[PDB]
A and B are shown apart, each in its own frame.
Chain A
Amino acid sequence: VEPVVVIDGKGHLVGRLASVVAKQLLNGQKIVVVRAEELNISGEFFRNKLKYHDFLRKATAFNKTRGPFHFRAPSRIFYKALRGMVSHKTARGKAALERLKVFEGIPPPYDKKKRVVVPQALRVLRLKPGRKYTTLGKLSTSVGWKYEDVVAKLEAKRKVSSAEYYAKKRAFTKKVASANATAAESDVAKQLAALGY
């Protein structure tokens, strides 16, 4: 219900994460997807490996440039599973997509804001315990995208830059928590209970 919805990508299914996004982009709800390389796919690591190559070789014969492209990056392999859902030929599906922006890891502006999840996506609430899964990073790093470890570095960086944060944020609430209870018992506190709050 907010101007720019920031979806965190960890713990999601490439299929069922995009399916809700494709509709949330036709309602005029802006989205920026972040931390893609931890996104997941049903089935084992080897299936997706050959879910892919058989699409990797589909390039048009008489010239390779103008054939169907193949994007190795962790983003686009999601962004390809998305742009198919939206129908983009008529101008609606074109200007509709620029509501959407995809990223790997996190970009500079959009880490500072609260990062959400979609209840019906997560690998934890769908797949059966004991079933396998595939980390899209593990996939795209193997099928010829490059930079994963360099992205894994920045993640292993900002986690620390956000670590000192949470302490200063929590320790602040530690004051306010009992300070929420230091004003209790008062004649106004008895009424808020009768008033429900």
Chain B
Amino acid sequence: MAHFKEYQVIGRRLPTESVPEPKLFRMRIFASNEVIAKSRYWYFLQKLHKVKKASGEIVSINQINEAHPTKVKNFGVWVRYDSRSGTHNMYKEIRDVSRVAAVETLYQDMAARHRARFRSIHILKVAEIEKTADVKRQYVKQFLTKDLKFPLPHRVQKSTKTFSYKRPSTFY
């Protein structure tokens, strides 16, 4: 959808004079800006609690950054997505640097293989898997092995001119 930012949002409802301090709530939204957060937020209240923006309020909007951009991490992601033939669960695992870019790698996927737009894909959860060997799929298990070595076959290098006299090769 864009380069993302992981936001937290806290709605307090609107207190009636009879009821001060509602219990609040908070949800972790993946959105591309301040506003798109707020709106995509209210979308999850209407489908949980009867309350909505008309009776509602937002306490705070706070971006979150990954506390450890350093380490490579393995993200299990539960995805509920509506689609043509119905709605389905998924569990797809992503090998990616940080939570906020881990999801962007997912829309590129879920909008390719299963042909779902951003409108139709909820994010049910994102969690790192502590130890390895708890990983599910092979294609995440693929790169966990010791000291990986591979060549990149069949190199290509982007060309500028419309003529190159030397018959460029793939050597690499």
Contacts and interface: CB of A to CB of B under 8 A. Distances in A.
- A–B touch (CB < 8 A): the answer is yes
B132 to A, nearest CB: 32
A20 B168 CA distance: 17
Interface string A6-30: 0000010000000010001000000
B156 A125 contact: yes
Contact of A119 (B153, B154, B164, B170): B164
Given A118-B163, A129-B153, 11 more contacts: A11-B167, A116-B163, A117-B164, A117-B167, A119-B162, A119-B163, A119-B164, A124-B169, A125-B156, A125-B170, A129-B154
A24 B165 contact: no
B161 interface: yes
Interface in A3-56: 5, 11, 20, 24
Interface string B130-172: 0000000000000000000000011010010111110111100
Interface of A: 5, 11, 20, 24, 114, 116-120, 122, 124-125, 129
Contacts of A5: 163
Given A117-B167, A124-B170, A24 B162 contact: yes
A124 B155 CA distance: 10
Contacts of B170: 124-125
Given A117-B167, A119-B168, A125-B168, A20 B162 contact: yes
19 contacts: A11-B167, A20-B162, A116-B163, A116-B164, A116-B165, A117-B164, A117-B165, A117-B167, A117-B168, A118-B162, A119-B159, A119-B161, A119-B163, A119-B164, A120-B159, A122-B168, A124-B169, A129-B153, A129-B154
A121 B72 CA distance: 39
A125 B169 CA distance: 8
B158 to A, nearest CB: 9
Contacts of B163: 5, 116-119
